[PDB]
C-alpha cells in the first residue's frame, strides 16, 4: 500500500510525463488558421501554433473582455476548453455564461464544481480512515445540486456529518477558489489512464466505460494543482470562476450492502451570476434536499 502523498506525486509525475510526451510529439512550430465566426468582431483570422496555442490565446489576441468573459469554446461545433491546445485549423466561437443558450457552459460549470468538491472530500477525511471516489454523475442543473459519490470507511458506516463538518468542506472549497488553480486538461490513452488510476476499482470502471464509449479509447483527464480526475467533458478555465460555493448535504444511497455509497451534494454560482443573500439561502435549502438521477 502506498501513502496518499506518494499516490498523489505518482499520479502527478505520470501526468507530467504524458503531457511532456505530447509536447515532444509536437516539437516543431506549425501554423494553423482559426476563424473567429462569432457575432462580435466577425470573420477574424488567427494564425495559431499547432498544439501550443489555445482558445485563451485567441482571447488574448482579441481583448481582455474575451479573456475574462469567455468560459467555453465552440471549436467546429463541439465544446472545447479555454486552456486546451488547438490541434487543427478550425472555426472558434467563445461561449459566456449569459448567452441565449448557455447550457454547455452550465454543464461545464457543474462538472468543475463537482470535481472541486471531490478534491475537498479526498483531502478532508482523516489518514486513519479510507476514502474512495466513485463518480461524478451527470446531474441536470435544474435539479439544484451537483453530486459526487464517495465510499467511506467501514468504521464510518454509522457516521453522519454535522453542520460544522459541512462548513469545513465549504471553507476548504473556498480556500481552493482563493488558490485560483487552472483546470489543466489532457486527452489521454486509456492504458495510461489506467496507469494513473490503478489503485481505484471504481475509477477503473469509469475509465473502461469511457474507453468503450469512444472508438480510440481517449479519455479526458483534468488536474487542479495535485488532484487528477476523469471527466465527462470540458471544464471551466479556473477555480476563480466560482464565487458562491457551498457543500450542502451528505446522504446515504439506498443499497447499504455490499458497500455504502455516500452522495455529497453542493451548490455554486459564478462571479458573473452571483445572487443575493436571500436567493442564495433558498438555493442552499433546495440543494440540501436530496437529488435523484
Amino acid at each position: 500500500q502506498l501513502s496518499p502523498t506518494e499516490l498523489t506525486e505518482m499520479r502527478n509525475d505520470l501526468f507530467n510525463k504524458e503531457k511532456a510526451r505530447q509536447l515532444s510529439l509536437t516539437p516543431r512550430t506549425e501554423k494553423i488558421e482559426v476563424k473567429h465566426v462569432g457575432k462580435t468582431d466577425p470573420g477574424t483570422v488567427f494564425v495559431m501554433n499547432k498544439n501550443i496555442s489555445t482558445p485563451y490565446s485567441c482571447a488574448m489576441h482579441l481583448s481582455e473582455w474575451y479573456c475574462r468573459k469567455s468560459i467555453l469554446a465552440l471549436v467546429d461545433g463541439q465544446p472545447w476548453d479555454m486552456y486546451k491546445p488547438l490541434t487543427k485549423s478550425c472555426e472558434i466561437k467563445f461561449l459566456t455564461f449569459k448567452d441565449c443558450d448557455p447550457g454547455e457552459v452550465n454543464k461545464a460549470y457543474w462538472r468543475s464544481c463537482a470535481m472541486m468538491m471531490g478534491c475537498v472530500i479526498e483531502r478532508a477525511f482523516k489518514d486513519e480512515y479510507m476514502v474512495n471516489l466513485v463518480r461524478a454523475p451527470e446531474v441536470p442543473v435544474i435539479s439544484g445540486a451537483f453530486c459526487y459519490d464517495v465510499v467511506l470507511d467501514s468504521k464510518l458506516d454509522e457516521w453522519m456529518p454535522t453542520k460544522e463538518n459541512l462548513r469545513s468542506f465549504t471553507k476548504d472549497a473556498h480556500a481552493l477558489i482563493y488558490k485560483d488553480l487552472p483546470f489543466e486538461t489532457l486527452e489521454v490513452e486509456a492504458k495510461v489512464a489506467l496507469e494513473i488510476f490503478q489503485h481505484s476499482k471504481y475509477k477503473v470502471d469509469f475509465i473502461e466505460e469511457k474507453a468503450s464509449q469512444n472508438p480510440e479509447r481517449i479519455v479526458k483527464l483534468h488536474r487542479i494543482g495535485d488532484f487528477i480526475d476523469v471527466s465527462e467533458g470540458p471544464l471551466i478555465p479556473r477555480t476563480s470562476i466560482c464565487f458562491q460555493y457551498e457543500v450542502s448535504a451528505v446522504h446515504n444511497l439506498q443499497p447499504t450492502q455490499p458497500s455504502l455509497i455516500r452522495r455529497f451534494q453542493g451548490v455554486s454560482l459564478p462571479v458573473h451570476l452571483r445572487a443575493h443573500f436571500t436567493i442564495w439561502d433558498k438555493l442552499l435549502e433546495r440543494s440540501r434536499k436530496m437529488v435523484t438521477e
Binding site: 457575432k39 462580435t40 468582431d41 473582455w65 468573459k69 449569459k98
Partner: protein, 108 residues
C-alpha cells in the same frame, strides 16, 4: 481680500491630489452583446444606437420625399417596406415607404 502669502507646492499638491479631486474609476462598463463594443449598463450602445439612427434618418428622408412640402402629415398609419417585400393584408390601408436595401436582420 487678497492673499497674504504665496501657497506652496506642498499645500497645492495636497489640495489638487486629494482623492475628492481625482477621477473615479467606473464599474458600470459592459461589452454589448450584439456588436461587441463597450457600453454602460444603464445606457444604450452608441454603435447600435447610431446604426438605428442612420437607418431612421434614411427612412425619414424617404418619408419627406413622399410628403413633398410642409404641412402634409398623413391621417393613416405608416409602414416601411424593403426590397423584395409585398404589403401584407394587415398592412392594407397604410402609407408604404420604400427603401432600396435588404431589410436589416435587427429590423422585424
Amino acid at each position: 481680500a487678497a492673499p497674504k502669502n504665496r501657497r506652496t507646492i506642498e499645500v497645492n499638491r495636497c489640495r489638487r491630489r486629494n482623492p475628492q479631486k481625482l477621477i473615479k474609476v467606473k464599474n458600470n462598463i459592459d461589452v454589448c452583446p450584439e456588436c461587441g463594443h463597450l457600453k454602460q449598463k444603464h445606457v444604450l450602445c452608441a454603435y447600435c444606437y447610431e446604426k438605428v439612427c442612420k437607418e431612421t434618418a434614411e427612412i425619414r428622408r424617404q418619408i419627406g420625399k413622399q410628403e413633398g412640402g410642409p404641412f402634409k402629415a398623413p391621417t393613416i398609419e405608416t409602414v416601411v417596406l424593403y426590397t423584395g417585400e409585398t404589403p401584407s393584408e394587415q398592412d392594407q390601408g397604410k402609407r408604404i415607404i420604400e427603401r432600396d436595401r435588404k431589410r436589416p436582420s435587427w429590423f422585424t
